[PDB]
From a paper:
Here, inspired by natural and re-engineered protein–peptide systems, we set out to design proteins made out of repeating units that bind peptides with repeating sequences, with a one-to-one correspondence between the repeat units of the protein and those of the peptide. We use geometric hashing to identify protein backbones and peptide-docking arrangements that are compatible with bidentate hydrogen bonds between the side chains of the protein and the peptide backbone. We design repeat proteins to bind to six different tripeptide-repeat sequences in polyproline II conformations. The proteins are hyperstable and bind to four to six tandem repeats of their tripeptide targets with nanomolar to picomolar affinities in vitro and in living cells.
Crystal structures reveal repeating interactions between protein and peptide interactions as designed, including ladders of hydrogen bonds from protein side chains to peptide backbones.
Author numbering: 0 to 279
The structure:
């Protein structure tokens, strides 16, 4: 399993740095390596669970399209097919986004492995703390995607219940809400891909500069990628605030639909749609 061998090598290298730091006496490097190696384990475990929920979402959206076609409602089946296609495009973008983030971590840890092996302990500590911030930022993106997945799953359940209850207006309005949530996630993936590629370029500068002996250039480039990751985290914190404001609206739509007040549930999903379109 190539998806399993690359992760094992990443964790093995960092754990090897922690053992070498302890025998040499650098506990700051040891505690930084041990914590970074653990953050990678949690990012891998959280990534595996994130992949399963996304597959589950795609099955549900496709399941609705096949069911709505058999029940006669064709306009809802086309809307679910359009929603499913964008969910697939969103997942494929996340795959390339994940593939570039993994390369980010590998390059940084390669800098840390070479810096610690060549004696530059201050450069090795700088690389490991940048690697940890990159993993922490990735975990914050994984948790945020899971929050987005929950928004989609709740909306998909409303559309299925409304479809089986003959409430096509609420079913179409829900799928449209789930549709915009996927479009908003796509636009966030596009802007993130532009940032991650920019960070890859800067990290390749530090790796080559260290191998060629430009230590001052290597530290400044590695330092530049650190604040780029930190600046990206601060911007993502604001996006998390809006999503929580959307989840509260979906809970109002859930409670209005289960209690029969369908007019309040439609107004709630409509207000949530305007907020989603404004996010990105």
């Amino acid at each position: 399993a190539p998806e399993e061998e690359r992760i094992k090598y990443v964790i093995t290298v960092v754990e090897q740095i922690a053992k070498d730091a302890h025998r040499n006496g650098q506990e700051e490097l040891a505690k930084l390596a041990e914590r970074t190696a653990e953050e990678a384990k949690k990012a891998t475990e959280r990534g595996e669970e994130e992949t399963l929920r996304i597959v589950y979402v795609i099955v549900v959206v496709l399941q609705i399209a096949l069911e709505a076609h058999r029940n006669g409602q064709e306009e809802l089946a086309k809307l679910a097919l359009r929603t499913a296609e964008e969910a697939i495009k969103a997942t494929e973008r996340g795959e390339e986004e994940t593939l570039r983030i993994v390369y980010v971590i590998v390059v940084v840890l390669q800098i840390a492995l070479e810096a610690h092996r060549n004696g530059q302990e201050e450069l090795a500590k700088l690389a490991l703390r940048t690697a940890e911030e990159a993993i922490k930022a990735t975990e914050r993106g994984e948790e945020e995607t899971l929050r987005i997945v929950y928004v989609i799953v709740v909306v998909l359940q409303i559309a299925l219940e409304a479809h089986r209850n003959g409430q096509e207006e609420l079913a179409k309005l829900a799928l449209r809400t789930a549709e915009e949530a996927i479009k908003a996630t796509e636009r966030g993936e596009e802007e993130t891909l532009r940032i991650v590629y920019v960070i890859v370029v800067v990290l390749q500068i530090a790796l080559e500069a260290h191998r060629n002996g430009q230590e001052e250039l290597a530290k400044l480039a590695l330092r530049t990628a650190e604040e780029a990751i930190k600046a990206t985290e601060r911007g993502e914190e604001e996006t998390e605030r809006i999503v929580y404001d959307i989840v509260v609206v979906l809970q109002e739509a859930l409670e209005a639909h289960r209690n029969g007040e369908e007019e309040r549930a439609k107004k709630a999903l409509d207000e949530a749609r305007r907020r989603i379109e404004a996010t990105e």
